[PDB]
Ligand binder design. Structure first.
Ligand SMILES: CCCCCCCCCCCCCCCCCC(=O)OC[C@H](CO[C@@H]1O[C@H](CO[C@H]2O[C@H](CO)[C@H](O)[C@H](O)[C@H]2O)[C@H](O)[C@H](O)[C@H]1O)OC(=O)CCCCCCCCCCCCCCCCC
Ligand code: CLA
Ligand code: CLA
Ligand code: CLA
Ligand code: CLA
Ligand SMILES: C=Cc1c(C)c2cc3nc(c4c5[nH]c(cc6nc(cc1[nH]2)C(C)=C6CC)c(C)c5C(=O)[C@@H]4C(=O)OC)[C@@H](CCC(=O)OC/C=C(\C)CCC[C@H](C)CCC[C@H](C)CCCC(C)C)[C@@H]3C
Ligand SMILES: CCCCCCCCCCCCCCCCCC(=O)OC[C@H](CO[C@@H]1O[C@H](CO)[C@H](O)[C@H](O)[C@H]1O)OC(=O)CCCCCCCCCCCCCCCCC
Ligand SMILES: CCCCCCCCCCCCCCCC(=O)OC[C@H](COP(=O)(O)OC[C@@H](O)CO)OC(=O)CCCCCCCCCCCCCCC
Ligand SMILES: CC1=C(/C=C/C(C)=C/C=C/C(C)=C/C=C/C=C(C)/C=C/C=C(C)/C=C/C2=C(C)CCCC2(C)C)C(C)(C)CCC1
Ligand SMILES: CC1=C(/C=C/C(C)=C/C=C/C(C)=C/C=C/C=C(C)/C=C/C=C(C)/C=C/C2=C(C)CCCC2(C)C)C(C)(C)CCC1
Ligand SMILES: CCCCCCCCCCCCO[C@@H]1O[C@H](CO)[C@@H](O[C@H]2O[C@H](CO)[C@@H](O)[C@H](O)[C@H]2O)[C@H](O)[C@H]1O
Ligand SMILES: CCCCCCCS[C@@H]1O[C@H](CO)[C@@H](O)[C@H](O)[C@H]1O
Ligand code: OEX
Ligand SMILES: [Cl-]
Ligand SMILES: [Mg+2]
Lengths: 55, 505, 34, 342, 63, 30, 35, 56, 56, 37, 80, 39, 33, 36
């Protein structure tokens, strides 16, 4: 918690696995990502005016 | 003295007081059954088996009475919607009174056995110590159980001397108690074939009679006697608990999946019937056959029974509930009054559009309308600024066929949207939400509650099995290990075979 | 007079053998390119 | 001449490096196959046909992302036996259909049975009371409720946990979004039993280590203990005074202490299993009805409970299309729940 | 201890506490019935599960 | 009613703490 | 508010001085063995 | 955001709510507020609690 | 509120995929496990000092 | 037979083996499959 | 102890290393070749980087039928 | 008739009996050859 | 807040029934010789 | 008269306190769900 406080975060394997053409092959890390996105876009729903949540 | 969690251990050496405690427990359980049936009868509305059946009303014991042939009241009604019936003594009310009277007689017997505990019958004639011959008791009880099981199958379920059991068609529209013949072929092992249940009880009964005679006449092997501690009544508690958790799991599973012994008119529909759109497929079949034989759309939808449409509604799915959302399903969505009819949605071009239905997993669900090939054509947007598919932009309308709203068409976008929000739940009904002050939030049926309580209790009885098994097999070390336990028996190197002093090095 | 075939020896090999095979397979995979 | 049964018993119960016993005949093969099936699947086997995911080192996943994934939803609760009617004896197809999921789950279940039978078997031979077996009923209740009962209540094995590190994380987050499982008091009792157990483990180990008797000259104090010594190695009297003065209460009975250490985390796991039996049926602690009535009528009423529900609504909408591919969900951008900007 | 009419009649049914058949007795036969019961449970499970599918046995409300 | 109930249970727990501490069964070394 | 502030500043100062002076008052010596 | 029992919470939903984002990391004792009413609005109790708790 | 903090933290940091949180889970799951193990092993081996009608 | 190859060397060599194979796996996180590239 | 030779005696002996300096590398190389020859793909039915999708589809070959899932996979594979 | 799944059922049943039969034959044999000394 | 009307009686009996059970047992333990 | 299977029962002070803490804490936990 005390190092994520300074935004050094968990591993990000989002789109890490790619096929011969360059299609993304999802892993269970990508499905976590979808869940995280749902939390992200909904939290503090009237507090963000700009597109990145930088803190 | 004894700690609180061991008080009942005073009964281990006291057969007469054990029997009394058993009689007390039996009196309590039978008094619960009577009390429960009376409460249900005081609250059950019998006026509408179509849209207000028992399983909408939080009825738990009523369906059990019905399953085995008790379907009428002394006040003149039957659960299939008959009037002027004479059930005889064995109405719901007679069954509840019988259980109350039994409870009372069992309570009196408990008193006699508690006071006259020291009967010569419970003493070993050779030692004068209290003693029960548990192997022979087993055979006597198994013989008795086999007889009852056989007779239940041969006389009650067949109708030969008894009423039969509840059976229905595959869509749960015309259920009734009927005599049922045994199925002796392989289809008897199909959970959905009622003749299997009859055959089960005839065959398993005969088997119990035979094994029972076996167990009355042949003593256990010394080897099994010692290993299962057959002189210790606690061994019987252990194995009995195991059998009971097995059986509790089986009744949970057949309640949740459905079988010939868990009909939909008594316990409600299953969650799987929503999953596979079972009722919707049959509805659409009947409508297409109507259409193929000449009918208008109005006529074809108007020929669908309200009862069939009601099964095609997620508010009757048992997987929609909540652990602390208490009471009958009627407390949530309301008391169903009537089918509104089948809603057909169309855009401005007049193409038919289909509301995407809510799966059981989702407490809330968006409103999305597709054409017949699954292409999205309309929706209810969250963000509006980049909306492309709103009902206003696509000119969505709704027309109703069958039911109350038959022949009506709505074009006001808020109204069409309101009906689309109901369409995620399947077919649309009118409900009375006032009589019970319904809150609008879905509850499970007796199928869901039964299933929950039996799965939980079965899991907890696993711990009981392990606990009492352990106590049985480790009785000698219940208060601790031998104070002068040999260090050689537990150290390594000394005995060649673990725990055998005769294998010393 | 220490024996070689023992239950322990068998137990060790049921794990050690596949483990080394698998580690070779996974080492190879590190050179696979899409 | 003694009988063959008794001769086999001797041999099964020989004191060896790895005890075997009669329990060993169930335990060893089921444990070995569960573990080998997991190592095989995570190393070599895909989930493309069941989930549309890569799941093995072969495909490029790492230790965090590999898994043996559940079968497709259309499999229902099929046993999915190698020789069953889905795979029909074809090993390759079996793998592609998720047959290793049921293989690992069922051999793992029989192996846990064998492990607890081992605990009873060894306890009996050495002459101790079988509390360790009894404590192990908790891990069993958890495995059975979560890997078996939960999916049996749901549509299919698909919604069981898949055997993998990231896959399990997904299972956590699904439970928050769909079941609001953090709100469930049976989960809450589980948390108290696990964190309370970890608290007891730390506090008890630390207390004994800081009330030790000086029984040696070493500054490193581990050598000053002998297993066969009759005497307590640490002072219960001093430990008791310390905690009585620091916290207000203290243990004074060592038998009660050690029993309580069994009781707390075993009871907690058992409570958590009961909650998951409820979730098998979607019988959730999802809502507080009174909160909903107020919030619906009063648009200025907000609590942390209503906030968390907005998060759950986000999780379900954003995850369901990829997490539930058999549903063929298409959620146009315009229907997705989002706050401002993000 | 107290004698009663019904206790006197039942007395022989609670008179063989501790009585065993020699050695292994009917154990092997018990084992065969256990084995058979196991196969029976496996059959009725596999039928319900649709892993064992039999002619004329449609595991659905439509039979 | 609900607030009174939650506060009442809490208050009982705080009282229990006081008795469990100051009116404990004294640890006796003999 | 100004009075609340002063009161709390005095209270805090008092306990802090107890802590500092208390620990300066022969603390190593307050143990059951070598002093 | 309502945190307290008397303002519509139960034991599971209730909380002492963190101090306002407008404050940030600024020290917000009682004597920084123009009134107890302001102090309550802006989440003053959270800071008093957590600072005394971490110290204690 | 604690659950709210947890869910947002997962959104913003992917805590579940952070090895220190993973060490935390091994710490508490393992503390619970060894808690039950130790309790059960010591309890298994209590010296007989009491009769069947008394708590050990 | 015996104690010819000292245990400290066995330990050191086997430990270095483990480091090499694990190091190789970390290399692979950045090249080929799973590299995101 | 239980009678088996100490591990420390075994793994510091020359005989152990004569045997295992052959068996260990051999097994490693065999596992390597299991992957390098492509055989692993075909035993387990795992797609190669070029076989997740046909050239112009972006539809996953999800199995949708319990009893002819075997054939659905067969057909999904013929259509690459 | 014998459906393909009933034939599969028999195959699973035979396979299981073989694994068990072989496991017990081998352990019985080993136990007979490799006896515990009671001296 | 529109709470369930049985919540009060349920909570009250949940506390009182087992609590009084324990009190009964405690007091009659103290009154033993 | 005289049943020889009778035994006194006990609950010591500490057990009372532990049991009351369990009950009260369960009540504090479950009450919110009972009021709903
Ligand atoms: C304690 C600890 C002990 C130690 C550990 C022990 C480890 C032992 C391992 C045992 C394995 C059990 C496998 C159960 C397989 C199963 O169930 O598989 C389920 C099958 C039924 O299959 C399902 O049936 C469903 C309903 O279909 C029905 O309804 C449909 C919709 O209308 C159609 O009509 C359809 O044709 C009709 O069949 C769906 O089709 C599903 O997709 C299909 O999977 O039932 C069945 O085999 C059998 C159902 C009856 C017996 C259940 C007993 C065991 C399970 C107890 C837990 C259940 C709890 C419920 C939740 C709480
Ligand atoms: C298996 C038993 C069972 C089942 C399945 C049902 C099912 C049903 N009953 Mg019946 N009922 C039962 C037993 C049962 N009842 C008993 C024994 C009684 C006498 C009390 C009743 C009296 C009764 C009444 C008076 C009513 C019903 C009604 C109903 C319906 C709604 C149920 C509901 O809302 O539950 C809600 C369930 C819960 C809120 C879950 C409770 C979980 C508890 C609190 C857990 C406690 C945990 C514990 C403290 C932790 C220990 C921890 C420790 C070890 C550390 C439903 C059909 C209602 C109705 O619709 O009837 C027409 C109705 O009015 N029932
Ligand atoms: C047929 C089922 C059955 C029977 C007859 C027994 C009988 C017994 N048990 Mg076992 N037990 C069982 C199932 C059973 N148990 C199950 C399912 C579990 C796991 C939950 C256990 C776990 C267990 C443990 C852990 C222990 C026993 C012990 C005992 C003995 C003393 C019990 C006593 O004095 O309690 C006195 C109980 C009270 C004064 C109050 C209990 C109140 C409970 C906790 C809540 C309210 C209960 C409510 C009325 C239940 C309704 C019924 C329910 C099924 C719906 C006694 C031989 C004890 C023993 O071995 O002593 C040597 C012991 O330590 N049992
Ligand atoms: C104790 C060891 C043990 C146990 C308990 C299991 C248990 C299981 N195995 Mg595993 N297995 C084992 C060891 C074990 N296995 C070993 C050593 C191997 C390597 C050979 C395997 C390889 C394996 C595979 C490859 C698979 C399983 C599967 C299974 C499952 C179904 C088994 C089945 O239906 O058998 C049915 C058989 C029996 C129950 C034996 C009954 C014998 C009775 C008592 C006598 C009847 C004999 C009869 C008269 C013979 C004549 C028949 C005639 C009519 C033709 C189950 C979880 C399947 C599974 O996991 O699918 C997901 C699966 O595909 N096992
Ligand atoms: C403070 C935070 C916290 C804490 C302490 C807990 C604690 C718990 N959680 Mg909760 N959880 C949390 C937050 C938390 N959770 C949050 C915020 C969420 C989001 C909703 C969840 C979602 C969640 C879910 C979805 C589940 C839990 C479950 C649990 C229980 C897991 C018990 C266990 O050890 O299972 C571990 C597994 C077992 C004990 C099974 C047996 C395992 C055998 C013995 C393993 C043998 C391994 C073998 C030797 C091979 C190893 C090989 C090696 C290579 C890997 C436990 C009570 C579970 C539960 O309730 O279970 C009933 C569960 O399903 N939680
Ligand atoms: C994630 C949590 C967790 C793990 C991994 C775990 C693991 C373990 N617990 C054991 C014991 C115990 N656990 C206990 C209480 C607890 N255990 C807890 C939580 C866990 N316990 C908790 C919270 C408690 C408190 C109640 C007790 C009291 C014991 C023991 O006595 C025993 C022991 O000896 O510990 C030292 C050992 C059982 C050995 C065994 O069965 O071998 C045989 C292996 C078998 C039968 C195979 C199991 C296969 C599993 C079920 C399914 C497949 C698993 C895959 C191989 C791996 C998938 C990995 C992904 C999910 C990432 C093992 C080390
Ligand atoms: C001496 C005995 C008294 C002591 C007990 C005192 C009560 C204890 C608290 C029990 C609370 C449970 C009910 C919640 C509150 C409530 O208002 O419900 C109230 C509900 C009744 O529901 C009411 O029905 C009304 C019309 O019928 C209206 O619809 C009301 O809106 C509705 O509240 O009570 C029940 O249904 C009770 C029966 C419960 C059935 C349980 C099945 C599940 C079994 C689970 C096993 C769990 C084991 C875990 C063990 C570890
Ligand atoms: C971070 C963890 C901290 C650990 C704390 C320290 C104490 C606990 C030790 C942890 C584990 C390491 C072991 C001690 C390490 C130690 O002290 O070394 C000493 C020990 C024995 O070495 P020796 O050379 O003296 O060999 C003597 C014996 O082999 C008998 O002659 O080595 C082993 O045990 C080898 C382990 C591999 C054996 C694997 C065989 C396969 C067995 C399968 C298991 C099944 C059992 C479960 C039933 C299903
Ligand atoms: C004596 C007599 C009589 C009478 C009788 C009577 C009147 C009876 C009654 C009875 C009754 C009237 C009974 C009742 C019972 C009940 C019960 C027994 C109950 C129980 C319950 C329970 C156990 C519960 C539980 C729970 C809860 C509470 C919560 C939820 C969960 C549960 C479910 C767990 C006569 C005249 C005949 C004559 C002879 C004599
Ligand atoms: C499934 C199946 C089966 C079986 C198989 C088997 C039994 C297998 C096994 C397998 C195995 C048995 C494998 C193994 C592998 C292993 C591995 C892969 C390992 C790795 C490792 C590592 C990588 C390490 C790391 C680490 C750690 C852990 C800690 C310390 C540090 C370090 C980092 C070093 C059969 C045929 C019957 C049938 C069908 C199906
Ligand atoms: C030793 C400490 C014990 C503390 C006990 C304190 C009780 C004595 C003070 C009573 C003050 C509470 O006064 C409170 O005021 C506001 C008016 O603006 C009310 O207004 C409130 O109504 C509802 C009540 O469910 C709330 O959900 C809502 O968030 C709020 O608008 C509260 O309902 C009322 O109860
Ligand atoms: C478990 C299987 C039951 C044991 S069976 C038993 O086997 C004995 C030898 O051990 C023989 O002496 C005897 O004839 C036979 O009846
Ligand atoms: O505040 Mn509480 O949560 Ca940390 O990120 Mn930015 O800010 Mn708000 O959004 Mn996301
Ligand atoms: Cl938020
Ligand atoms: Mg790579």
């Amino acid at each position: 918690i005390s190092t994520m406080a300074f935004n050094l975060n968990g591993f990000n394997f989002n789109h890490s696995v790619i096929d011969a053409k360059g299609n993304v092959i999802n892993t269970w890390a990508d499905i976590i990502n979808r869940a995280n996105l749902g939390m992200e876009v909904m939290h503090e729903r009237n507090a963000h005016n700009f597109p990145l949540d930088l803190a | 003295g004894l700690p609180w969690y061991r008080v009942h251990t005073v009964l281990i050496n006291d057969p007469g007081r054990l029997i009394a405690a058993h009689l007390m427990h039996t009196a309590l359980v039978a008094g619960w059954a009577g009390s429960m049936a009376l409460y249900e009868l005081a609250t059950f509305d019998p006026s509408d088996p179509v849209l207000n059946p028992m399983w909408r009303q939080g009825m738990f014991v009523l369906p059990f009475m019905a399953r085995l042939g008790v379907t009428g009241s002394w006040s003149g009604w039957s659960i299939t919607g008959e009037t002027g019936i004479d059930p005889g003594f064995w109405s719901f009310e007679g069954v509840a009174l019988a259980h109350i009277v039994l409870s009372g007689l069992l309570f009196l017997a408990a008193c006699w056995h508690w006071v006259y505990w020291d009967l010569e019958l419970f003493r070993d004639p050779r030692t004068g110590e209290p003693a029960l011959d548990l192997p022979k008791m087993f055979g006597i009880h198994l013989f008795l159980a086999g007889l009852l099981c056989f007779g239940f199958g041969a006389f009650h379920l067949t109708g030969l001397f008894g009423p039969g059991m509840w059976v229905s068609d595959p869509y749960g529209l015309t259920g009734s108690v009927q005599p049922v013949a045994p199925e002796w072929g392989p289809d008897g092992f199909n959970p959905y074939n009622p003749g299997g249940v009859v055959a089960h009880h005839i065959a398993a009964g005969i088997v119990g009679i035979i094994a029972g005679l076996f167990h009355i006449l042949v003593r256990p092997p010394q080897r099994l006697y010692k290993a299962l501690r057959m002189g210790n009544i606690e061994t019987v508690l252990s194995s009995s608990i195991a059998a009971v958790f097995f059986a509790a799991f089986v009744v949970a599973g057949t309640m949740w999946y459905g079988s010939a012994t868990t009909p939909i008119e008594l316990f409600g529909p299953t969650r799987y019937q929503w999953d596979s759109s079972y009722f919707q497929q049959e509805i659409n079949r009947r409508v297409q056959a109507s259409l193929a034989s000449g009918a208008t759309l109005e006529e074809a939808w108007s020929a669908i029974p309200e009862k069939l449409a009601f099964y095609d509604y997620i508010g009757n799915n048992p997987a929609k509930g909540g652990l602390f959302r208490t009471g009958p399903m009627n407390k949530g969505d309301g008391i169903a009054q009537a089918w509104k009819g089948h809603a057909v949605f169309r855009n401005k071009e007049g193409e038919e559009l289909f509301v995407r239905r809510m799966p059981a997993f989702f407490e809330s669900f968006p409103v999305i309308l597709t054409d017949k090939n699954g292409v999205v054509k309309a929706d209810i947007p969250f963000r509006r600024a980049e909306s492309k598919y709103s009902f206003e932009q696509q000119g969505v309308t709704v027309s109703f066929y069958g039911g109350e709203l038959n022949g009506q068409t709505f074009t006001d976008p808020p109204t069409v949207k309101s009906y689309a929000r109901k369409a995620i739940f399947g077919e649309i009904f009118e409900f009375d939400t006032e009589t019970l002050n319904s809150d609008g939030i879905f509850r499970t049926s007796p199928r869901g509650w039964f299933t929950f309580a039996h799965a939980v209790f079965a899991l907890l009885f696993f711990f009981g099995h392990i606990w009492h098994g352990a106590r049985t097999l480790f009785r000698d070390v219940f208060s601790g290990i031998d104070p002068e336990l040999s260090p050689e028996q537990v150290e390594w190197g000394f005995y060649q075979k673990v725990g055998d002093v005769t294998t010393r090095r | 007079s220490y024996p070689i075939f023992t239950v322990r020896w068998v137990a060790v090999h049921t794990l050690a053998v596949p483990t080394i095979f698998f580690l070779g397979a996974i080492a190879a995979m590190q050179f696979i390119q899409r | 001449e003694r009988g063959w049964f008794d001769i086999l018993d001797d041999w099964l119960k020989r004191d060896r490096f790895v005890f075997v016993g009669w329990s060993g005949i169930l335990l060893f093969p089921c444990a070995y196959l569960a573990l080998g099936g997991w190592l095989t699947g995570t190393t070599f086997v895909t989930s493309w046909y069941t989930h549309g995911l890569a799941s093995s080192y072969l495909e490029g996943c790492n230790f965090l992302t590999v898994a043996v994934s559940t079968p497709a939803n259309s499999m229902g609760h099929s046993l999915l036996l190698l020789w069953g009617p889905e795979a029909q004896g074809d090993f390759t197809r079996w793998c592609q259909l998720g047959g290793l999921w049921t293989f690992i789950a069922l051999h793992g279940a029989f192996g846990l049975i064998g492990f607890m039978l081992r605990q009873f078997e060894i306890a009996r031979l050495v002459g101790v009371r079988p509390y360790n077996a009894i404590a192990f009923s908790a891990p069993i209740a958890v495995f059975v409720s979560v890997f078996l009962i939960y999916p049996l209540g749901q549509s299919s094995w698909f919604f069981a946990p898949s055997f993998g590190v990231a896959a399990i994380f997904r299972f956590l987050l699904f439970f928050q979004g769909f079941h609001n499982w953090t709100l469930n008091p049976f989960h809450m009792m589980g948390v108290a039993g696990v964190l309370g157990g970890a608290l007891l483990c730390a506090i008890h180990g630390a207390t004994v280590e800081n009330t030790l008797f000086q029984d040696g000259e070493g500054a490193s104090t581990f050598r000053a203990f002998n297993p066969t010594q009759a005497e307590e190695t640490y002072s219960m009297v001093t430990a008791n005074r310390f905690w009585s003065q620091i916290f207000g209460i203290a243990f004074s009975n060592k038998r009660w202490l050690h029993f309580f250490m069994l009781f707390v985390p075993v009871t907690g796991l058992w409570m958590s299993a009961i909650g998951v039996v409820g979730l098998a049926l979607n019988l959730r602690s999802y809502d507080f009805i009174s909160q909903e009535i107020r919030a619906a009528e009063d648009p200025e009423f907000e609590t942390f409970y209503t906030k968390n529900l907005l998060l759950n609504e986000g999780i379900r909408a954003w995850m369901a299309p990829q997490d539930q591919p058999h549903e063929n969900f298409v959620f146009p951008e315009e229907v997705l729940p989002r706050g401002n900007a993000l | 201890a107290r004698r009663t009419w019904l206790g006197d009649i039942l007395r022989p049914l609670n008179s063989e506490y501790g009585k065993v058949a020699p050695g292994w007795g009917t154990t092997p036969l018990m084992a065969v019935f256990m084995g058979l019961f196991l196969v029976f449970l496996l059959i009725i499970l596999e039928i319900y599960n649709s892993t064992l599918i039999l002619d004329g046995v449609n595991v659905s409300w439509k039979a | 009613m609900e607030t009174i109930t939650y506060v009442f249970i809490f208050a009982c727990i705080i009282a229990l703490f006081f008795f469990a501490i100051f009116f404990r069964e004294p640890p006796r070394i003999t | 508010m100004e009075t609340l502030k002063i009161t709390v500043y005095i209270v805090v100062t008092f306990f802090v001085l107890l802590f500092v002076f208390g620990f300066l008052s022969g603390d190593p010596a307050r143990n059951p063995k070598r002093k | 955001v309502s945190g307290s029992l008397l303002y519509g919470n139960n034991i599971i939903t209730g909380a002492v709510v963190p101090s306002s984002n407008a404050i940030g990391l600024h020290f917000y004792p009682i004597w920084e507020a123009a009134s107890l009413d302001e102090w309550l609005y802006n989440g003053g109790p959270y800071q008093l609690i957590i600072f005394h708790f971490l110290l204690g | 509120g604690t659950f709210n903090f947890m869910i947002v933290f997962q959104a913003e940091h992917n805590i579940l995929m952070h090895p220190f949180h993973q060490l935390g889970v091994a710490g508490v799951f393992g503390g619970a496990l060894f808690c039950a193990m130790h309790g059960s092993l010591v309890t298994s081996s209590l010296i007989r000092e009491t009769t069947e009608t008394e708590s050990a | 037979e015996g104690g010819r190859i000292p245990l400290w060397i066995v330990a050191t060599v086997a430990g270095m083996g483990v480091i090499v194979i694990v190091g190789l796996f970390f290399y692979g996180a950045y090249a080929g499959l799973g590299s995101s590239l | 102890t239980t009678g088996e030779r100490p591990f420390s005696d075994i793994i510091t002996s020359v005989r152990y290393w004569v045997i295992h300096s052959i068996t260990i590398p051999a097994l490693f190389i065999a596992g390597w070749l299991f992957v390098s020859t492509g055989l692993a793909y075909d035993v387990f039915g795992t797609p190669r980087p070029d076989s997740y999708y046909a050239q112009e589809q972006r539809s996953i070959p999800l199995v949708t039928d319990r009893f002819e899932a075997k054939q659905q996979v067969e057909t999904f594979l013929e259509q690459l | 008739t014998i459906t393909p799944s009933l034939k599969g059922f028999f195959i699973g049943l035979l396979s299981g009996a073989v694994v068990l039969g072989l496991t017990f034959a081998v352990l019985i044999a080993i136990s007979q050859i490799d006896k515990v000394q009671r001296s | 807040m529109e709470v369930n009307q049985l919540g009060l009686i349920a909570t009250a009996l949940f506390v009182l029934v087992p609590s009084v059970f324990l009190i009964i047992l405690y007091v009659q333990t103290e009154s033993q010789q | 008269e005289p049943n020889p299977n009778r035994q006194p029962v006990e609950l010591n002070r500490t057990s009372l306190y532990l049991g009351l803490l369990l009950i009260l804490v369960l009540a504090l936990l479950f009450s919110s769900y009972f009021f709903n």
